[PDB]
Ligand binder design. Structure first.
Ligand SMILES: C[C@](O)(COc1ccc(F)cc1)C(=O)Nc1ccc([N+](=O)[O-])c(C(F)(F)F)c1
Length: 238
């Protein structure tokens, strides 16, 4: 039942709308990454709200958890698409936004990109199954919380425990749980580097001709700094 649901709500293909017939430029690549990010967020929200037990969470906690986990969720799913679509040869942000090393360099996010390429390869090396991937991704949504707590922390703790239990069931074991939780933890540092980069970019966006969508700018200026300043932190297994 649980896996049937995860499979049923998994988002379909999302395109960036990037002009690939134009020579690569920092400004156009980032504007497409921003637009793609916002298009994906629409889907992440619909996906999250359809998750088993997600409605149990307080209304305000639902929005917060989605906004904080947004980057991580995208990173994890992008790594999977890279592995399944191009065997980690490139980063498959979208069918019309595929990064080769040249674009990784031109985007000024080279180190983060190489770490995501390594993540992509890990899916292959660890032989992650589509079902482990689905459960792990859902678990990522419940892996970052505020130090001062959510409106209903207890409901959040129960839900996270339940998702961990589902992972146990998919696995069923110890060595595998170790491998998967280590892989999950590796997502956070990458999301952090992307958050930092994105934060710095928005602050100087007017200096590099980068276009930030309304909702994204609000989230980067209101939520992301809570993560960067240590007020909101990820939950690591290790
Ligand atoms: C630069 C940026 O547009 C910033 O997007 C944000 C995403 C979340 C957030 F809280 C703040 C900004 C970005 O990283 N976009 C992006 C778009 C798509 C994907 N993707 O499809 O996986 C990613 C990725 F997760 F890879 F890094 C990143």
């Amino acid at each position: 039942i649980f896996l049937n649901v995860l499979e049923a709500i998994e988002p379909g293909v999302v395109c960036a709308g990037h002009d690939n017939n134009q020579p690569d430029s920092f400004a156009a690549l980032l504007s497409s990454l921003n637009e793609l990010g916002e298009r994906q967020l629409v889907h992440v929200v619909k996906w999250a709200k359809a998750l088993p037990g997600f409605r149990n969470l307080h209304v305000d906690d639902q929005m917060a958890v989605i906004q904080y986990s947004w980057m991580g969720l995208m990173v994890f799913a992008m790594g999977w698409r890279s592995f399944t679509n191009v065997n980690s040869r490139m980063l498959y942000f979208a069918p019309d936004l595929v990064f080769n090393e040249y674009r990784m360099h031109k985007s000024r996010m080279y180190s983060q990109c190489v770490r995501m390429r390594h993540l992509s390869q890990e899916f292959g090396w660890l032989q992650i199954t589509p079902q482990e991937f689905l459960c792990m991704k859902a678990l990522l949504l419940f892996s970052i919380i505020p130090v001062d707590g959510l409106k209903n922390q207890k409901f959040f703790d129960e839900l996270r425990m339940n998702y961990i239990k589902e992972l146990d069931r998919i696995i069923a074991c110890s060595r595998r749980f170790y491998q998967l939780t280590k892989l999950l933890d590796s997502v956070q540092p990458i999301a952090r580097e992307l958050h930092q980069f994105t934060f710095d970019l928005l602050i100087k966006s007017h200096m590099v001709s980068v276009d930030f969508p309304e909702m994204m700018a609000e989230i980067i200026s209101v939520q992301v700094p809570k993560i960067l300043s240590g007020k909101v932190k990820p939950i690591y297994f290790h």
